[PDB]
Design a protein around this motif. Structure first.
Motif, PDB file in Angstrom:
ATOM      1  N   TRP A 126      10.440   9.416  -7.873  1.00  0.00           N
ATOM      2  CA  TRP A 126       9.789  10.726  -7.972  1.00  0.00           C
ATOM      3  C   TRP A 126       9.011  10.930  -6.700  1.00  0.00           C
ATOM      4  CZ3 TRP A 126      10.305  13.550 -12.641  1.00  0.00           C
ATOM      5  CH2 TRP A 126       9.559  14.732 -12.730  1.00  0.00           C
ATOM      6  N   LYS A 159       0.391  -3.089 -13.434  1.00  0.00           N
ATOM      7  CA  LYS A 159       1.555  -2.300 -13.734  1.00  0.00           C
ATOM      8  C   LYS A 159       2.327  -2.767 -14.935  1.00  0.00           C
ATOM      9  CE  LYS A 159       1.486  -0.142  -9.475  1.00  0.00           C
ATOM     10  NZ  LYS A 159       0.801  -0.467  -8.184  1.00  0.00           N
ATOM     11  N   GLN A 192       9.804   1.766 -11.640  1.00  0.00           N
ATOM     12  CA  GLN A 192       9.362   3.054 -12.141  1.00  0.00           C
ATOM     13  C   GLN A 192      10.257   4.144 -11.623  1.00  0.00           C
ATOM     14  OE1 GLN A 192       5.682   4.630 -10.644  1.00  0.00           O
ATOM     15  NE2 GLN A 192       5.110   5.163 -12.729  1.00  0.00           N
ATOM     16  N   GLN A 193      10.686   5.006 -12.532  1.00  0.00           N
ATOM     17  CA  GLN A 193      11.573   6.093 -12.193  1.00  0.00           C
ATOM     18  C   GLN A 193      11.145   6.677 -10.887  1.00  0.00           C
ATOM     19  OE1 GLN A 193      11.687   9.207 -15.099  1.00  0.00           O
ATOM     20  NE2 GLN A 193      12.329  10.640 -13.494  1.00  0.00           N
ATOM     21  N   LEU A 241       6.324   8.385 -16.297  1.00  0.00           N
ATOM     22  CA  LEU A 241       7.576   8.177 -15.582  1.00  0.00           C
ATOM     23  C   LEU A 241       8.162   7.004 -16.325  1.00  0.00           C
ATOM     24  CD1 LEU A 241       6.688   8.063 -11.749  1.00  0.00           C
ATOM     25  CD2 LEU A 241       7.633  10.013 -12.929  1.00  0.00           C
ATOM     26  N   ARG A 281      -9.537   5.326 -10.061  1.00  0.00           N
ATOM     27  CA  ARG A 281      -8.747   6.296  -9.333  1.00  0.00           C
ATOM     28  C   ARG A 281      -7.344   6.320  -9.891  1.00  0.00           C
ATOM     29  NH1 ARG A 281      -8.188   4.013  -4.801  1.00  0.00           N
ATOM     30  NH2 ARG A 281      -5.896   3.939  -4.557  1.00  0.00           N
ATOM     31  N   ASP A 289      -3.421   7.867  -9.333  1.00  0.00           N
ATOM     32  CA  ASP A 289      -2.488   8.369  -8.328  1.00  0.00           C
ATOM     33  C   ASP A 289      -1.426   9.262  -8.957  1.00  0.00           C
ATOM     34  OD1 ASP A 289      -3.901   7.137  -6.185  1.00  0.00           O
ATOM     35  OD2 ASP A 289      -2.727   5.258  -6.386  1.00  0.00           O
ATOM     36  N   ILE A 312       2.479   5.950   0.232  1.00  0.00           N
ATOM     37  CA  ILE A 312       1.091   5.977   0.655  1.00  0.00           C
ATOM     38  C   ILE A 312       0.651   4.525   0.866  1.00  0.00           C
ATOM     39  CG2 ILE A 312      -1.242   6.348  -0.083  1.00  0.00           C
ATOM     40  CD1 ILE A 312      -0.050   8.939   0.566  1.00  0.00           C
ATOM     41  N   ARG A 371      -1.293  -3.773  -4.355  1.00  0.00           N
ATOM     42  CA  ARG A 371      -2.102  -2.651  -3.942  1.00  0.00           C
ATOM     43  C   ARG A 371      -1.941  -2.392  -2.457  1.00  0.00           C
ATOM     44  NH1 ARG A 371      -8.262  -4.323  -4.121  1.00  0.00           N
ATOM     45  NH2 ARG A 371      -8.321  -6.045  -2.564  1.00  0.00           N
ATOM     46  N   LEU A 429      11.836   1.595  -2.379  1.00  0.00           N
ATOM     47  CA  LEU A 429      12.306   2.860  -2.955  1.00  0.00           C
ATOM     48  C   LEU A 429      13.825   3.050  -2.860  1.00  0.00           C
ATOM     49  CD1 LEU A 429       9.526   5.450  -1.917  1.00  0.00           C
ATOM     50  CD2 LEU A 429       9.835   4.188  -4.054  1.00  0.00           C
ATOM     51  N   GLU A 435       0.132   5.281 -10.771  1.00  0.00           N
ATOM     52  CA  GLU A 435      -0.729   4.165 -11.207  1.00  0.00           C
ATOM     53  C   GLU A 435      -2.196   4.566 -11.486  1.00  0.00           C
ATOM     54  OE1 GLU A 435      -2.154   1.303  -8.513  1.00  0.00           O
ATOM     55  OE2 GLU A 435      -2.246   2.642  -6.770  1.00  0.00           O
ATOM     56  N   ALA A 467      11.335   3.067  -8.051  1.00  0.00           N
ATOM     57  CA  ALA A 467      10.396   2.413  -7.170  1.00  0.00           C
ATOM     58  C   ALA A 467      10.235   0.992  -7.703  1.00  0.00           C
ATOM     59  CB  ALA A 467       9.078   3.133  -7.197  1.00  0.00           C
ATOM     60  N   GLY A 501      -0.174  -0.393  -1.188  1.00  0.00           N
ATOM     61  CA  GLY A 501       1.168   0.117  -0.958  1.00  0.00           C
ATOM     62  C   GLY A 501       2.044  -1.010  -0.440  1.00  0.00           C
ATOM     63  N   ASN A 507      -5.717   2.827 -10.797  1.00  0.00           N
ATOM     64  CA  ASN A 507      -6.459   1.749 -10.174  1.00  0.00           C
ATOM     65  C   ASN A 507      -7.792   1.712 -10.928  1.00  0.00           C
ATOM     66  OD1 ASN A 507      -4.764   0.892  -7.889  1.00  0.00           O
ATOM     67  ND2 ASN A 507      -5.157   2.879  -7.020  1.00  0.00           N
TER      68      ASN A 507
HETATM   69  N1  LIG Z   1       7.990   5.988  -8.921  1.00  0.00           N
HETATM   70  C1  LIG Z   1       7.705   6.315  -7.656  1.00  0.00           C
HETATM   71  N2  LIG Z   1       8.434   7.318  -6.997  1.00  0.00           N
HETATM   72  C2  LIG Z   1       8.174   7.707  -5.648  1.00  0.00           C
HETATM   73  N3  LIG Z   1       7.178   7.144  -4.886  1.00  0.00           N
HETATM   74  C3  LIG Z   1       6.461   6.162  -5.516  1.00  0.00           C
HETATM   75  C4  LIG Z   1       6.624   5.717  -6.829  1.00  0.00           C
HETATM   76  N4  LIG Z   1       5.736   4.740  -7.111  1.00  0.00           N
HETATM   77  C5  LIG Z   1       5.042   4.622  -6.005  1.00  0.00           C
HETATM   78  N5  LIG Z   1       5.425   5.452  -5.020  1.00  0.00           N
HETATM   79  C6  LIG Z   1       4.828   5.561  -3.637  1.00  0.00           C
HETATM   80  O1  LIG Z   1       4.315   4.296  -3.321  1.00  0.00           O
HETATM   81  C7  LIG Z   1       2.878   4.288  -3.044  1.00  0.00           C
HETATM   82  C8  LIG Z   1       2.409   2.981  -3.657  1.00  0.00           C
HETATM   83  O2  LIG Z   1       2.596   2.962  -5.141  1.00  0.00           O
HETATM   84  P1  LIG Z   1       1.318   2.785  -6.073  1.00  0.00           P
HETATM   85  O3  LIG Z   1       1.789   2.834  -7.484  1.00  0.00           O
HETATM   86  O4  LIG Z   1       0.121   3.676  -5.719  1.00  0.00           O
HETATM   87  O5  LIG Z   1       0.970   1.309  -5.787  1.00  0.00           O
HETATM   88  P2  LIG Z   1      -0.500   0.488  -5.086  1.00  0.00           P
HETATM   89  O6  LIG Z   1      -0.065  -0.352  -3.930  1.00  0.00           O
HETATM   90  O7  LIG Z   1      -1.108  -0.314  -6.292  1.00  0.00           O
HETATM   91  N6  LIG Z   1      -1.572   1.707  -4.703  1.00  0.00           N
HETATM   92  P3  LIG Z   1      -3.031   1.557  -4.092  1.00  0.00           P
HETATM   93  O8  LIG Z   1      -3.896   0.526  -4.908  1.00  0.00           O
HETATM   94  O9  LIG Z   1      -3.619   3.014  -3.986  1.00  0.00           O
HETATM   95  O10 LIG Z   1      -3.071   1.226  -2.692  1.00  0.00           O
HETATM   96  C9  LIG Z   1       2.386   5.553  -3.707  1.00  0.00           C
HETATM   97  O11 LIG Z   1       1.156   5.947  -3.112  1.00  0.00           O
HETATM   98  C10 LIG Z   1       3.602   6.481  -3.563  1.00  0.00           C
HETATM   99  O12 LIG Z   1       3.555   7.207  -2.311  1.00  0.00           O
END
Ligand SMILES: Nc1ncnc2c1ncn2[C@@H]1O[C@H](COP(=O)(O)OP(=O)(O)NP(=O)(O)O)[C@@H](O)[C@H]1O
Ligand SMILES: Nc1ncnc2c1ncn2[C@@H]1O[C@H](COP(=O)(O)OP(=O)(O)NP(=O)(O)O)[C@@H](O)[C@H]1O
Ligand SMILES: [Mg+2]
Ligand SMILES: [Mg+2]
Ligand SMILES: [Mg+2]
Ligand SMILES: [Mg+2]
Lengths: 587, 587
Positions: free
Chosen positions: A540, A467, A537-538, A484, A291, A293, A574, A507, A514, A305, A500, A509, A307
């Motif tokens: 966004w 990451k 990460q920049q 990014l 998946r 994102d 998220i 994972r 931020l 990311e 971020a 979230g 996954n």
């Molecule tokens: N660079 C960014 N700018 C703005 N929002 C961000 C950024 N990186 C992450 N986010 C928000 O943070 C959430 C978590 O970041 P994510 O890179 O998906 O990490 P995760 O915990 O590994 N995801 P997951 O395995 O789906 O549960 C995302 O779903 C976005 O809503």
């Protein structure tokens, strides 16, 4: 069908599901369309191949070819019909969809240039044997006036887009098509309330759906009468991006596993390094699902990311949302993930997995339906499963072999567990795994790392799911349109844009911070990974649409697009508790 | 416990079987079920991705100075420490036993699984053949005595000798020098048989088609004096085997390095169009080489290798059969034919090649190639293949579609060629892909029209042209400077080569054609005409063959599926060996 008609230069045959055409374990295409010939031609003659595409005309939009022998990426320039850049032999020639090529479009190979003509080799135009030893299917009039070169097709209602050449020289070449911001906008919609979701709309007759209920009830999101849509132009951008970033991620994975300084950045136990490499080298083609994102809005498309280790939401996007549709959508649109089960079943049918695979999930009622959703795929592919809920049904014989409950051997497994978990058990003089125990206490790491077991997803998939790979992707594809800027520090350019903070192996979230281009902490989440290496990460921000931030998710099934789904949250980040938001693609 | 029964696992899950009397893991040869070396090598590969060359006896491992990283054919340094050394015997290291006592002449090897300040635990395979304590991941414990910085191990046996341990590291401190053999053992001696008329009439059995094939070409004769022979000591053969396996791995590493860098590959003068295929070939047909031949200078001065004929080499019939006949006919001593099992090991490498059921043998119409074809036909036949020899190309033709077919109309899909690839490359030097015919009026098939047909699976694989081309000598020199067996070879006459004198040699020649041997005095010791005058030369440090009993003897070792396959001689009235030089009986 399949009758050999002749051969393109170099001896490339030309002919007229179980039609997959492979050369080794490299997918050439579908028997026997125009794309399969062009790909195979390029694969047998130059060792290169272009990424998966729906229609042939989608090829003219690529800007890179992959060199298989070393997962290396090369530049591919495009040229419009009527160019100073002459159409040399071996170059890709593409047709836009139109006329003779109604919706598909078309592709062929230029086998030889002349003074007033050109010879092309191709499939799915000619279905008759060719004359003895002739290595071309058609000739095309070329007009060379004032240094400019034009080709005239033999049909009277077909547009020729142009040719393409693998070269660094960008001269005379056109820019990479960039999609309109408006076409990428997500927008809300509503069904007419006739009490369609007022009761037990989820079919409790289906075991899979019912397992879902047990873990979530008759619910998809707060308001099931509302949904979102994306233009069919966006889904295509989503397919371009998914397939393209998929290759990028592997190009970086290979790059990582080729240099101890880059691998060293992922904090994986240094004892698993040789095994990472070996896994990459012999299971490179064995990844099943993933998946991605994304943030999608008028600004364009960005990746947060990938996954790739252990993803989920498949059941939601590929089964529940379908019920939702069948239950309350009377429109023309469609669920961008409808055929996920089959896509998966497909990937399994071609995976060198054992006939009997053990499914290893955690003892969480939430994983139950996910394991079973996948088990459906494995069963559709003809495998035998046995869903292991926890490590208790597991045991060893006297010699030290892994047997399940029924007493059978466990040599092939599809896990829900993320590899980093087994990794944890290591972080406590060669992979320390037990091969016997007084109480028969078998652990996660005692299975997934038992050399004799065939695991899915492969071990190497943890490189792209980590990451620490994002900063590397940036390094290799600087300023790429979907990327990014991310680094292991807050550099000058990031400090300026906002960023971020993210744990490399996290994972759900978790432990995400931020910060704006100012100072403020726009949002923060807790989590269990507050102690690992972070990346920056920049920033966004997710687009807010109808009172909810929304992140687009695509799935990769065996390297290629598998569908799209939505995820919404009242906040920018998220989380695991986020809702799945029905999505419907429209044209 | 019977044979093949699993007794337990070493660290990381490396199983240990009972060898109460051959194993591969994927495409990598591990050993022979279930010797102490088969386990030693398997441990390393499954746990560390490295492996050590084929050794005759387990005790020989201690003389090796490098390991091989499989996932990239890269070469790692491996030091040897005597038993009693300051260097502590860390876990994972190799423990080698010298032949003696309990381990008579085979010697023995094992893996240190753990240290305890006063003890050490090891795992091995051919010592105990009984199940191990449920869960115990070791087979024995040795007493380690630490006195004033030094480390000594005491073996549980009273009559055995422990050489020491080995550690893959760049730190050479405390380590041992890579043993050298006493030049006196490398001397080739002259011998004579008692003349009682063993070689006066027809000693070669003419009812054997093979021998008759030889005779129709050469008559009842091997050389000018069938009563005189040469000898080398079993120690020289061990050295020769040592060097053959080592150089084979070296050349293969040099090949990998060349096909990974355009600036190198370009020094070979191989038509560019073939580059992508050269690479594709190295990647798939990595372990498909059947047999090669190395040319050495051996004498008190030591061992030097002139070339490695890896594309097409002959002398297999001479050494592995005719000399067998010679001995069985006129020898009664205790020595032996160093090439006696060629046919058997030949069938071996075929049985394990990914070869197709029916193999077309392709030779040139030379009454002399007939027995080299037929000799090879026997091995194919023994490995269970169907063959049909093709003399020349008249019998080849195409179907109406363009498929290659033989005389009897069958499809030509697999092929063992006698022809040298360069011959086919030549047919390219006279487009947008390899220029082959897939049809032709006169149904006139060329050599290249077969070898470069994509569906045609050929032996030896395309990539072997690289190691077989002498442009690899400079490369090899560059990678392994002043290597024990290498000779200073460059593409110009550098200062150093001016001092020693050197051989001028074409990069793609054979038969000893166009060779120029110039002295340090700058004199032309010898020259040979040829058809390769016009190609690129390499210049190699002079190192004249020794003169023994009136002739100059050059030693030859056969490589077969990568490992030593036997030795044979070639003598000549000149310092230059040629296609006419006879074979001299060795024992
Ligand atoms: N660079 C960014 N700018 C703005 N929002 C961000 C950024 N990186 C992450 N986010 C928000 O943070 C959430 C978590 O970041 P994510 O890179 O998906 O990490 P995760 O915990 O590994 N995801 P997951 O395995 O789906 O549960 C995302 O779903 C976005 O809503
Ligand atoms: N560096 C050198 N110093 C002295 N003699 C040499 C040297 N290199 C080659 N020779 C002699 O020259 C002969 C021909 O060289 P070689 O490297 O075997 O070339 P070739 O023609 O490719 N061999 P082949 O394929 O067996 O016929 C050898 O067999 C030696 O007799
Ligand atoms: Mg995410
Ligand atoms: Mg994630
Ligand atoms: Mg030679
Ligand atoms: Mg040669």
């Amino acid at each position: 069908f399949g009758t050999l008609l002749g051969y393109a230069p170099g001896g490339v045959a030309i002919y007229s599901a179980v039609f997959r055409s492979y050369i080794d374990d490299e997918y050439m295409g579908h028997k026997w369309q125009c794309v399969e010939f062009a790909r195979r031609f390029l694969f047998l003659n130059y060792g290169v191949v272009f990424t998966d595409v729906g229609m042939a005309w989608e090829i003219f939009s690529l800007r890179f070819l992959r060199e298989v022998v070393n997962d290396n990426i090369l530049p591919l320039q495009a040229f419009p019909n009527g160019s100073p850049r002459a159409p040399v032999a071996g170059a890709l020639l593409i047709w836009d969809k139109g006329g003779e090529f109604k919706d598909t479009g078309h592709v062929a190979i230029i086998t030889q240039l002349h003074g007033n003509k050109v010879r092309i080799a191709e499939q799915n135009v000619i279905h008759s044997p060719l004359p003895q030893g002739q290595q071309w299917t058609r000739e095309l009039e070329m007009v060379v006036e004032n240094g400019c070169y034009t080709l005239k097709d033999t049909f009277d209602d077909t547009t020729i887009l142009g040719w393409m050449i693998q070269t660094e020289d960008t001269e005379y070449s056109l820019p990479q098509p960039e999609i309109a911001g408006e076409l990428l906008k997500i927008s809300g919609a509503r069904l007419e309330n006739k009490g369609q979701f007022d009761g037990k709309w989820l079919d409790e007759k289906d075991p899979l759906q019912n397992a879902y209920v047990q873990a979530n009830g008759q619910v998809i999101n707060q308001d099931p009468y509302h949904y979102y849509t994306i233009t069919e132009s966006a889904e295509q951008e989503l397919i371009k991006a998914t397939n393209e970033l998929h290759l990028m991620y592997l190009h970086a994975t290979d790059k990582v596993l080729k240099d101890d300084n880059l691998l060293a950045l992922f904090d994986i136990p240094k004892i698993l390094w040789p095994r990472l490499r070996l896994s990459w080298q012999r299971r490179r083609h064995h990844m099943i699902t993933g998946r991605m994102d994304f943030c999608m809005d008028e600004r364009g498309l960005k990746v947060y990311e990938y996954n790739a280790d252990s993803a989920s939401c498949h059941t939601e996007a590929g089964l529940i949302l379908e019920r939702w549709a069948e239950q309350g959508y009377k429109g023309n649109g469609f669920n961008p993930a409808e055929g996920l089960i089959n896509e998966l079943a497909g990937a399994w049918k071609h995976s060198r997995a054992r006939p009997f695979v053990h499914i290893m999930q955690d003892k969480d009622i939430e994983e139950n339906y996910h394991a079973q959703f996948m088990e459906q795929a494995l069963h559709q592919a003809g495998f035998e499963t046995r869903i292991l809920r926890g490590l208790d049904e597991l045991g060893w014989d006297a010699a030290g072999q892994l047997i399940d409950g029924e007493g059978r051997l466990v040599n092939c497994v599809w896990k829900t567990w993320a590899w980093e978990t087994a990794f944890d058990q290591i972080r406590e003089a060669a992979v320390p795994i037990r091969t016997g125990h007084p109480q028969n206490e078998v652990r996660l790491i005692d299975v997934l790392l038992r050399p004799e077991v065939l695991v899915f997803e492969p071990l190497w998939t943890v490189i792209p799911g980590n990451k620490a790979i994002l900063p590397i992707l940036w390094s290799l594809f600087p300023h790429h349109r979907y990327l990014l800027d991310t680094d292991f520090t807050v550099n000058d350019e990031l400090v300026k844009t906002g960023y971020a903070v993210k744990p490399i192996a996290g994972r759900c979230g978790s432990n995400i911070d931020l910060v704006s281009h100012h100072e403020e902490v726009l949002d923060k989440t807790s989590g269990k990974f507050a102690e690992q290496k972070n990346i920056y990460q920049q920033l966004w921000c997710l687009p807010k649409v109808d009172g909810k931030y929304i992140q687009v998710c695509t799935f990769t099934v065996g390297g290629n697009y598998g569908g799209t789904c939505l995820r919404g949250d009242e906040s920018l980040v998220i989380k695991k508790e986020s809702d799945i938001e029905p999505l419907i693609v429209v044209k």
